[PDB]
Design a protein around this ligand. Structure first.
Ligand SMILES: *[C@@H]1O[C@H](CO)[C@@H](O)[C@H](O)[C@H]1NC(C)=O
Lengths: 194, 123, 107, 110, 123, 122, 107
């Protein structure tokens, strides 16, 4: 049976980058030819494995993360990058294998006056360990004063909206990302090309 | 995930009314509450909005200006303060919420609602 | 302001039928509308958010679809407990808006 | 936390085929994550029964069979004896890297 | 051939903190995906939070958020569970479990399970 | 164009009181949150006091706390730093600073005001 | 309460040079830092904001960089309209500690 990529890429709403979803792909054929001939997919960068040769490889399983970020942060979804995304929201490991698809979604995930509910993490006590999601919303102690449950000066709340308007530039419009990941282990293989 | 309001009752035409919305169970700050209106007999209609941090406070065109909507992130409540309310603005007033981390609730949808306070004019 | 029209305004059916409910927009809404169920005398809760996904805690007999201007809600098999109004609410502008509602009746 | 709904107690007759449902959702099983099964004898740590929705490790007879179908699952136990008065658990994973276990099953003989 | 052993039973006053160890054995520790299972007596199982010691990540469950800090040491081949702010509802059995096949992705079954560590809370 | 004029100041005996008014509209005022900074003549800059967006919570400096009281009538479009129990060190220019953003993730003041001065002598 | 240092404290440069100024903190902030220019006799004004972006109203001969414990404001080409002193400012922790000053002398 064919790959169920129609339920990952063509979903109607994605998760925000501080709390993303991870789906498992198993028992299928990895037909990327329904996906690769979509040339407005403005980024198809592949670390670890090479593009256009995916259909002649056998794998164990495929994990497909999903979130939305603005266009100035797509260079941060990569092994070994920094910023206010790859240290506070979603950090890939250094020896990661998998392609990082990223296209433009300014018609889809954008509306007038902001679309206020795609959050992102501003403050954390330390940088993220790799593949660590973070959903906790306790207030961040910036200075030295423990304020204990009420925010103000030197203790803020660590989530702001993205405020996506369709009249921004090419850099501030929502670039919807899917970063698939591949794994190989000593086991029977359920995901391979035709 | 429970939600409960208070502060409703009977009032003369042209006075003020605090309307609470005591929130509990979810993290109150990282959402954006609304106020959904249900006139007796008629369908739902929209009244007000807030933002995440309290930035902008838009209103529907029928009740703008006369309504002022507040926010108290320390007590995790919500206040809607209307001024000079008219006799046609008699309804049930609900509370709302919507955030897109898929973990939590349907995006762009009023997922959790209160029991509903009934504001009614009198004479 | 985005005027949104839901059709029809008064429907009738019986147990088991496939019931469709359509909703028309004025201008474009990029798959950002939701479907609500309000039993008479209660709090309206959500069934379909963002026009294609079902809220966790809803029996999977419901189905909705559409993108752009027109959107359809299709109930597969009716039940005695699914006889209530159905609201069409969008999410695009500064001014959010609700539909008019489809009353469901018996035969 | 435990999204998996499981029947509380199921029974039958000595020498029959008993089944156990495991109703998931769209966020745990329907997202493509597999479902395993555990067996808890009363007074020790639970064991491993079915992995990969159908297989069996070395140490369990062929009376133990399971399968998944869309969102739900099943576990069939043929031939009840006096080594089935125990607790069986349905295990899976949420989409959001979260863990879930079943509520609990009680298999008793007649 | 692979098995886990834990610390003995402990008693704690309501308000203290408990450190429960899980001493792994059999092979290498760097490929393990230890995830903790809490079990109050007479109820079902519960997931606590996973940790991959080759990365140091800690994906906690949504209930045990901000209460437990699951850490692991690579030298001593143990993975701790620093459950702080103990209450009266946390008397239970606490198991640790390797996660089957994979290491970089902990989404598998649980084999082995160690043995019970009845950390009870009383006076 | 954002405009910020402020008024007050002059001369005072050591131990007196002043009202330093930072009052200029130039924008939608009630949503912002503005602060105070100071600079002794021939020395570096110094931060003294700040106020919330609604006048709720203030935060004073380390060496200034207890002696001042910042208040703002947000409807009057005015900002008051009310001096009390000053010393010789407080002879400086007091500028007004306006915040950049609307209300949260505070930092990075946007524009500076014109400036009043105070002096101490006998 | 972060005691910012600033290097240099004074310098003499003519038109057609490249001066880099550093402002190094003790407590590690992360890209919460501006830069200031103060003409003697009147108020300072914002030059760059959040250590990378540029405010409207300045030629692009200045540039900000750095993230962490050390930042570098660089001037690519000197001009005869830069006869002032400069200030760095942290705003991560709320007692704002401005720098010392760097007099740019022309000769
Ligand atoms: C998503 O849907 C569109 C329209 O149905 C289709 O053209 C496109 O190929 C789909 N994307 C896939 C299958 O990756």
């Amino acid at each position: 049976n064919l790959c169920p990529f129609d339920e990952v890429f063509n979903a109607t709403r994605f998760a925000s980058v501080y709390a993303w979803n991870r789906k498992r792909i198993s028992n299928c054929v990895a037909d990327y030819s329904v996906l690769y001939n979509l040339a407005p997919f403005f980024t198809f960068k592949c670390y670890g494995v090479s593009p256009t040769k995916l259909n002649d490889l056998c794998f164990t399983n495929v994990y497909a993360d999903s979130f939305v970020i603005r266009g100035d942060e797509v260079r941060q979804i990569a092994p070994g990058q920094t910023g206010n995304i790859a240290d506070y929201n979603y950090k890939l490991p250094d020896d990661f294998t998998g392609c990082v698809i990223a296209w433009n979604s300014n018609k889809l995930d954008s509306k007038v006056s902001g679309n206020y509910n795609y959050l992102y993490r501003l403050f954390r006590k330390s940088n993220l360990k790799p593949f660590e999601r973070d959903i906790s919303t306790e207030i961040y102690q910036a200075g030295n004063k423990p304020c204990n449950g009420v925010a103000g000066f030197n203790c803020y709340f660590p989530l702001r909206s993205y405020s996506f308007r369709p009249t921004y530039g090419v850099g501030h419009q929502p670039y919807r990302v899917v970063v698939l990941s591949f794994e190989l282990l000593h086991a029977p293989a359920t995901v391979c090309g035709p | 995930v429970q939600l409960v309001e208070s502060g409703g009752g009977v009032v003369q035409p042209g006075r003020s009314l605090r309307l609470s919305c005591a929130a509990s169970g979810f993290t109150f700050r990282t959402y954006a509450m609304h106020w959904v209106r249900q006139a007796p007999g008629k369908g739902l209609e929209w009244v007000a909005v807030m933002w995440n941090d309290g930035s902008n406070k838009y209103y529907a065109d029928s009740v703008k200006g006369r309504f002022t909507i507040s926010r108290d992130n320390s007590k995790n409540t919500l206040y809607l303060e209307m001024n000079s309310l008219r006799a046609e603005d008699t309804a049930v007033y609900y509370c709302a919420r919507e955030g897109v981390a898929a973990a939590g609730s349907s995006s762009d949808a009023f997922d959790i609602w209160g029991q509903g306070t009934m504001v009614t004019v009198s004479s | 302001d985005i005027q949104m029209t839901q059709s029809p305004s008064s429907l009738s059916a019986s147990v088991g039928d496939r019931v469709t409910i359509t909703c028309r927009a004025s201008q474009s809404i990029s798959n950002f509308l939701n479907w609500y169920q309000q039993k008479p005398g209660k709090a309206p809760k959500l069934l379909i958010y963002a026009a294609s996904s079902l809220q966790s805690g809803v029996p999977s007999r419901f189905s909705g679809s559409g993108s752009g201007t027109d959107f359809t809600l299709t109930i597969s098999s009716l039940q005695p407990e699914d006889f209530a109004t159905y609201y069409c609410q969008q999410s695009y502008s500064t001014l959010y808006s609700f539909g008019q509602g489809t009353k469901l009746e018996i035969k | 936390q435990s999204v998996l709904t499981q029947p509380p107690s199921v029974s039958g007759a000595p020498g029959q085929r008993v089944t156990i449902s495991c109703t998931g959702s769209s966020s745990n099983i329907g997202s493509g994550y597999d479902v395993h099964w555990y067996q808890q004898l009363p007074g020790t740590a639970p064991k491993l029964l079915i992995y990969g929705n159908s297989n069996r490790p070395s140490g369990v007879p062929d009376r133990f069979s399971g399968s998944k179908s869309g969102t739900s699952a099943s576990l069939a136990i043929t031939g009840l004896q006096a080594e089935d008065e125990a607790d069986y658990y349905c295990q899976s994973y949420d989409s959001s890297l979260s863990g879930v276990f079943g509520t609990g099953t009680k298999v008793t003989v007649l | 051939q692979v098995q886990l052993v834990q610390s003995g039973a402990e008693v704690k006053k309501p308000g203290s903190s408990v450190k429960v160890s899980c001493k792994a054995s059999g092979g290498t520790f760097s490929s393990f995906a230890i995830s903790w299972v809490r079990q109050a007596p007479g109820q079902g199982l519960e997931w606590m939070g996973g940790i991959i010691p080759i990365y140091g990540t800690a994906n906690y469950a949504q209930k045990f958020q901000g209460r437990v800090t699951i850490t692991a040491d690579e030298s001593t081949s143990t993975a701790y569970m620093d459950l702080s702010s103990l209450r009266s509802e946390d008397t239970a059995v606490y198991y640790c479990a390797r996660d089957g096949s994979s290491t970089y992705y902990p989404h598998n079954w649980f084999d082995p399970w160690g043995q019970g560590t009845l950390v009870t809370v009383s006076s | 164009e954002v405009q910020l004029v402020e008024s007050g100041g002059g001369l005072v005996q050591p131990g007196g009181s002043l009202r330093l008014s930072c009052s200029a509209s130039g924008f939608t005022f009630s949503s912002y949150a503005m602060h105070w900074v100071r600079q002794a003549p021939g020395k570096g800059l110094e931060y003294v006091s700040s106020i919330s967006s609604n006048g709720g919570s203030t935060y004073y400096a380390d060496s200034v706390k207890g002696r001042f009281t910042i208040s703002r009538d947000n409807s009057k479009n005015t900002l008051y730093l009310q001096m009390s129990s000053l010393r010789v060190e407080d002879a400086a220019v007091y500028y007004c600073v306006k915040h950049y953003q609307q209300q949260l993730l505070w930092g990075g003041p946007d524009v500076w005001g014109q400036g009043t001065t105070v002096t101490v002598s006998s």
